[PDB]
Amino acid sequence: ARSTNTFNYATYHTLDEIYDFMDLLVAEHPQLVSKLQIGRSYEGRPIYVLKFSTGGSNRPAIWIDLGIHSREWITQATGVWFAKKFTEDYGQDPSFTAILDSMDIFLEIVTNPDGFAFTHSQNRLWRKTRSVTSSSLCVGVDANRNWDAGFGKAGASSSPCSETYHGKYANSEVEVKSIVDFVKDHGNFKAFLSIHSYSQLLLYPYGYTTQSIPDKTELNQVAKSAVAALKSLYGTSYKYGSIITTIYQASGGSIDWSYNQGIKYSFTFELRDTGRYGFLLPASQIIPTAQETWLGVLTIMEHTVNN
Ligand SMILES: [Cu+2]
Ligand SMILES: [Hg+2]
Ligand SMILES: [Hg+2]
Ligand SMILES: [Hg+2]
Ligand SMILES: [Hg+2]
């Protein structure tokens, strides 16, 4: 509220409160975090990424996005918890400290701000962007079907009213283009994590093709390790594997894109729960979710630093 220390992390918040939170954080930790705007949403809301760094120029970096599917509120809540945690742990946690001493971390807490507002205003379950058009009264695109990785293949719908509509062409949604251009311009990303809910899964590419990635042994070992760390705190059980073998065929997904850009450590997390509450996870599960996900994420970052 008046300081990140008084912000209530154990409750869900609106867009404005999250945006306010970002400014407070930057104000409190100017030497570590900065707020960059990498685009504007369809309805004109700024799209912000927090950059965490101890210096250097173009250091290898880690991208983390949350909330691309707006109704997955647990994700934006986890994103705010992570932002705070980074600032607390630097200097206290040996491992994390080593990570930030050598790499920068870019965190996008609200990747789909128009959808997020819509979830507070009109439809709690809204998943897509809010882009409109012409040959349909249906609004919106599945931003996780809009990337240029098997765009348009099986695993996405071409019907505008579908929950999985892929949109007119790859990267047609501003919310996606913005990340694409930012990552391509930076050119030094080593890891790309996209956070979703629900199902308790840790996935690696690909989703659009049965073809195995060349780094499959390593990512799989990574995922296994991360899942082991994550389970350690509360016993939360995750499965892991490639998107297509674990879930279903899905095209135009972000991690397929990042992996094809050469960002080896590309993974998607599907947070709690397994169906009991689904998207409507109680506020009381915020903190435990966030704490256990951190362990998983930290294990991937460690791997990254050392490889
Ligand atoms: Cu899923
Ligand atoms: Hg600080
Ligand atoms: Hg702080
Ligand atoms: Hg999702
Ligand atoms: Hg805490």
Side-chain angles (χ1 to χ4, degrees), residues 28-32 87:
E28 315 173 2
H29 311 249
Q31 240 74 288
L32 203 53
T87 74

Side-chain angles (χ1 to χ4, degrees), residues 196-199 201 203 247-248 270:
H196 287 251
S197 82
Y198 63 96
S199 275
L201 297 180
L203 309 182
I247 309 195
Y248 39 50
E270 281 280 7

